[PDB]
mmCIF file of C-alpha atoms in Angstrom:
data_model
loop_
_atom_site.group_PDB
_atom_site.id
_atom_site.type_symbol
_atom_site.label_atom_id
_atom_site.label_comp_id
_atom_site.label_asym_id
_atom_site.label_seq_id
_atom_site.Cartn_x
_atom_site.Cartn_y
_atom_site.Cartn_z
ATOM 1 C CA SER Z 14 -71.022 130.898 -178.995
ATOM 2 C CA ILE Z 15 -67.483 130.321 -180.256
ATOM 3 C CA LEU Z 16 -67.795 126.692 -179.132
ATOM 4 C CA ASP Z 17 -70.366 126.202 -181.916
ATOM 5 C CA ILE Z 18 -67.951 127.130 -184.737
ATOM 6 C CA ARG Z 19 -66.840 123.806 -186.228
ATOM 7 C CA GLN Z 20 -65.084 123.217 -189.539
ATOM 8 C CA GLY Z 21 -67.057 121.275 -192.119
ATOM 9 C CA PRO Z 22 -65.539 118.143 -193.657
ATOM 10 C CA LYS Z 23 -64.744 120.086 -196.852
ATOM 11 C CA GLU Z 24 -64.828 123.697 -195.640
ATOM 12 C CA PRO Z 25 -61.634 125.585 -196.566
ATOM 13 C CA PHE Z 26 -59.616 126.248 -193.428
ATOM 14 C CA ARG Z 27 -59.453 129.979 -194.197
ATOM 15 C CA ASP Z 28 -63.245 130.353 -194.260
ATOM 16 C CA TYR Z 29 -63.469 128.367 -191.024
ATOM 17 C CA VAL Z 30 -60.922 130.779 -189.544
ATOM 18 C CA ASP Z 31 -63.020 133.706 -190.794
ATOM 19 C CA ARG Z 32 -66.192 132.466 -189.083
ATOM 20 C CA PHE Z 33 -64.274 131.483 -185.943
ATOM 21 C CA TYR Z 34 -62.775 134.954 -185.542
ATOM 22 C CA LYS Z 35 -65.989 136.792 -186.417
ATOM 23 C CA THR Z 36 -67.640 134.916 -183.552
ATOM 24 C CA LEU Z 37 -64.557 135.372 -181.356
ATOM 25 C CA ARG Z 38 -64.599 139.165 -181.693
ATOM 26 C CA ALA Z 39 -68.078 139.084 -180.107
ATOM 27 C CA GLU Z 40 -67.295 136.517 -177.392
ATOM 28 C CA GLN Z 41 -67.282 138.002 -173.880
ATOM 29 C CA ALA Z 42 -64.011 136.635 -172.535
ATOM 30 C CA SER Z 43 -60.651 137.976 -171.422
ATOM 31 C CA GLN Z 44 -57.710 138.184 -173.798
ATOM 32 C CA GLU Z 45 -56.146 135.240 -171.949
ATOM 33 C CA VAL Z 46 -59.188 133.050 -172.603
ATOM 34 C CA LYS Z 47 -59.355 134.299 -176.202
ATOM 35 C CA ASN Z 48 -55.682 133.446 -176.686
ATOM 36 C CA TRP Z 49 -56.458 129.952 -175.416
ATOM 37 C CA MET Z 50 -59.345 129.840 -177.907
ATOM 38 C CA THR Z 51 -57.144 130.762 -180.875
ATOM 39 C CA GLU Z 52 -54.449 128.334 -179.674
ATOM 40 C CA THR Z 53 -56.530 125.294 -178.667
ATOM 41 C CA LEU Z 54 -60.223 125.660 -179.524
ATOM 42 C CA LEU Z 55 -59.448 126.602 -183.135
ATOM 43 C CA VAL Z 56 -57.494 123.353 -183.550
ATOM 44 C CA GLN Z 57 -59.997 121.190 -181.654
ATOM 45 C CA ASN Z 58 -62.961 122.279 -183.808
ATOM 46 C CA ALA Z 59 -61.148 121.744 -187.115
ATOM 47 C CA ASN Z 60 -62.099 118.765 -189.258
ATOM 48 C CA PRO Z 61 -60.160 115.504 -188.782
ATOM 49 C CA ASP Z 62 -57.568 116.134 -191.513
ATOM 50 C CA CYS Z 63 -56.854 119.768 -190.654
ATOM 51 C CA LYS Z 64 -56.806 118.755 -186.990
ATOM 52 C CA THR Z 65 -54.217 116.057 -187.713
ATOM 53 C CA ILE Z 66 -51.980 118.523 -189.557
ATOM 54 C CA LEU Z 67 -52.338 121.243 -186.907
ATOM 55 C CA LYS Z 68 -51.653 118.741 -184.123
ATOM 56 C CA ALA Z 69 -48.541 117.698 -186.054
ATOM 57 C CA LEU Z 70 -47.424 121.347 -186.099
ATOM 58 C CA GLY Z 71 -47.117 121.294 -182.310
ATOM 59 C CA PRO Z 72 -47.652 124.102 -179.812
ATOM 60 C CA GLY Z 73 -47.039 127.774 -180.489
ATOM 61 C CA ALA Z 74 -47.772 127.646 -184.220
ATOM 62 C CA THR Z 75 -48.917 131.002 -185.555
ATOM 63 C CA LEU Z 76 -52.217 131.481 -187.352
ATOM 64 C CA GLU Z 77 -50.384 131.979 -190.657
ATOM 65 C CA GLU Z 78 -48.568 128.663 -190.200
ATOM 66 C CA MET Z 79 -51.879 126.909 -189.518
ATOM 67 C CA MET Z 80 -53.538 128.415 -192.593
ATOM 68 C CA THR Z 81 -50.575 127.438 -194.770
ATOM 69 C CA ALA Z 82 -50.531 123.922 -193.309
ATOM 70 C CA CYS Z 83 -54.191 123.238 -194.185
ATOM 71 C CA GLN Z 84 -54.338 125.030 -197.551
ATOM 72 C CA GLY Z 85 -54.284 121.820 -199.587
ATOM 73 C CA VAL Z 86 -56.591 119.665 -197.459
ATOM 74 C CA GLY Z 87 -59.307 117.991 -199.510
ATOM 75 C CA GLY Z 88 -57.380 118.200 -202.780
ATOM 76 C CA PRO Z 89 -55.614 115.518 -204.817
ATOM 77 C CA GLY Z 90 -52.197 116.535 -203.497
ATOM 78 C CA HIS Z 91 -53.359 116.064 -199.911
ATOM 79 C CA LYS Z 92 -54.812 112.611 -200.602
ATOM 80 C CA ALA Z 93 -51.650 111.504 -202.408
ATOM 81 C CA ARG Z 94 -49.516 112.885 -199.569
ATOM 82 C CA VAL Z 95 -51.474 111.000 -196.898
ATOM 83 C CA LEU Z 96 -51.311 107.790 -198.942
ATOM 84 C CA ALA Z 97 -47.557 108.278 -199.381
ATOM 85 C CA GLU Z 98 -47.172 108.834 -195.632
ATOM 86 C CA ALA Z 99 -49.101 105.633 -194.864
ATOM 87 C CA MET Z 100 -47.018 103.641 -197.356
ATOM 88 C CA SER Z 101 -43.895 105.125 -195.744
ATOM 89 C CA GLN Z 102 -45.076 104.086 -192.272
ATOM 90 C CA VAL Z 103 -45.775 100.518 -193.419
ATOM 91 C CA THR Z 104 -42.318 100.391 -195.022
ATOM 92 C CA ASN Z 105 -40.567 101.800 -191.929
ATOM 93 C CA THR Z 106 -42.351 99.163 -189.796
ATOM 94 C CA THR S 13 -59.263 113.505 -174.740
ATOM 95 C CA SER S 14 -60.027 117.224 -174.455
ATOM 96 C CA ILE S 15 -62.370 118.899 -171.981
ATOM 97 C CA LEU S 16 -64.130 120.275 -175.069
ATOM 98 C CA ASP S 17 -65.311 116.751 -175.954
ATOM 99 C CA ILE S 18 -67.032 116.243 -172.578
ATOM 100 C CA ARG S 19 -70.689 116.851 -173.460
ATOM 101 C CA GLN S 20 -73.698 115.791 -171.409
ATOM 102 C CA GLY S 21 -75.531 112.873 -172.974
ATOM 103 C CA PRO S 22 -79.250 113.099 -173.762
ATOM 104 C CA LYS S 23 -80.221 110.921 -170.769
ATOM 105 C CA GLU S 24 -77.037 111.369 -168.728
ATOM 106 C CA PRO S 25 -77.643 112.611 -165.156
ATOM 107 C CA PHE S 26 -76.217 116.091 -164.715
ATOM 108 C CA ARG S 27 -74.198 114.969 -161.677
ATOM 109 C CA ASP S 28 -72.391 112.288 -163.693
ATOM 110 C CA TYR S 29 -71.664 114.851 -166.409
ATOM 111 C CA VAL S 30 -70.178 117.163 -163.774
ATOM 112 C CA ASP S 31 -68.009 114.314 -162.477
ATOM 113 C CA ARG S 32 -66.699 113.519 -165.965
ATOM 114 C CA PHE S 33 -66.205 117.216 -166.700
ATOM 115 C CA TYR S 34 -64.107 117.901 -163.608
ATOM 116 C CA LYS S 35 -62.221 114.619 -164.017
ATOM 117 C CA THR S 36 -61.075 115.782 -167.450
ATOM 118 C CA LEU S 37 -60.575 119.335 -166.156
ATOM 119 C CA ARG S 38 -58.065 118.307 -163.483
ATOM 120 C CA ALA S 39 -56.053 116.771 -166.348
ATOM 121 C CA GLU S 40 -56.510 119.683 -168.766
ATOM 122 C CA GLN S 41 -53.382 121.785 -169.325
ATOM 123 C CA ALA S 42 -54.431 125.430 -169.064
ATOM 124 C CA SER S 43 -54.016 128.456 -166.829
ATOM 125 C CA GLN S 44 -56.257 128.939 -163.814
ATOM 126 C CA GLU S 45 -58.159 131.726 -165.597
ATOM 127 C CA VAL S 46 -58.911 129.480 -168.578
ATOM 128 C CA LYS S 47 -60.094 126.737 -166.221
ATOM 129 C CA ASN S 48 -62.271 129.260 -164.387
ATOM 130 C CA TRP S 49 -63.829 130.121 -167.748
ATOM 131 C CA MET S 50 -64.328 126.397 -168.378
ATOM 132 C CA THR S 51 -66.246 125.948 -165.117
ATOM 133 C CA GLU S 52 -68.208 129.182 -165.626
ATOM 134 C CA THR S 53 -69.049 128.888 -169.336
ATOM 135 C CA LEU S 54 -67.915 125.608 -170.912
ATOM 136 C CA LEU S 55 -69.698 123.499 -168.289
ATOM 137 C CA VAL S 56 -73.008 125.137 -169.226
ATOM 138 C CA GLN S 57 -72.454 125.164 -172.993
ATOM 139 C CA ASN S 58 -71.620 121.435 -173.068
ATOM 140 C CA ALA S 59 -74.779 120.421 -171.188
ATOM 141 C CA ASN S 60 -77.681 118.883 -173.061
ATOM 142 C CA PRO S 61 -80.308 121.294 -174.446
ATOM 143 C CA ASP S 62 -82.688 121.020 -171.475
ATOM 144 C CA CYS S 63 -80.081 121.338 -168.722
ATOM 145 C CA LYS S 64 -78.524 124.156 -170.749
ATOM 146 C CA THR S 65 -81.887 125.940 -170.787
ATOM 147 C CA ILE S 66 -82.259 125.578 -167.007
ATOM 148 C CA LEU S 67 -78.684 126.642 -166.209
ATOM 149 C CA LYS S 68 -78.984 129.623 -168.552
ATOM 150 C CA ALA S 69 -82.227 130.575 -166.796
ATOM 151 C CA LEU S 70 -80.502 130.492 -163.389
ATOM 152 C CA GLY S 71 -78.472 133.605 -164.209
ATOM 153 C CA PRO S 72 -74.823 134.300 -163.417
ATOM 154 C CA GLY S 73 -72.944 133.409 -160.266
ATOM 155 C CA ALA S 74 -74.748 130.100 -159.786
ATOM 156 C CA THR S 75 -72.721 127.756 -157.608
ATOM 157 C CA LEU S 76 -72.105 124.177 -158.689
ATOM 158 C CA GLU S 77 -74.554 122.938 -156.048
ATOM 159 C CA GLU S 78 -77.217 125.308 -157.386
ATOM 160 C CA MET S 79 -76.619 124.010 -160.913
ATOM 161 C CA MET S 80 -76.860 120.386 -159.781
ATOM 162 C CA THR S 81 -80.055 121.055 -157.814
ATOM 163 C CA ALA S 82 -81.603 122.806 -160.820
ATOM 164 C CA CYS S 83 -80.871 119.888 -163.176
ATOM 165 C CA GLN S 84 -81.816 117.139 -160.696
#
């Protein structure tokens, strides 16, 4: 079931997408439901960091935008960026 | 909270899980066809392993009352 495809804490987002769509191509649902799955279920089953970024992208983001947005998750640049964002929020408050 | 995070607890009565599920469903933002899929498929998939076994064994077209009676 597509509902069982969940992104691991350190799984690259592109591999998660690969598994998700391999299971999706076999799911017995209409193209409307499958569109909802690529739009909402894909984001909901991502790991916390990727899910935060995707949520920040807002509705209507294309698959390519999502894959680009989560490319660096788990790396030093991502950690430093989150820390910088937190520092910025404490400063702005 | 998303309807996808409504999962039946190990010792949660199936009726209470249905109540939670539909409570969150009435608030979910999705087309009527997606919601129909949620009641047809998601409701079963998010049940605990035993109730999921029973519901799966009922076959398709089972009404909500049939599902609740089966998992009583």
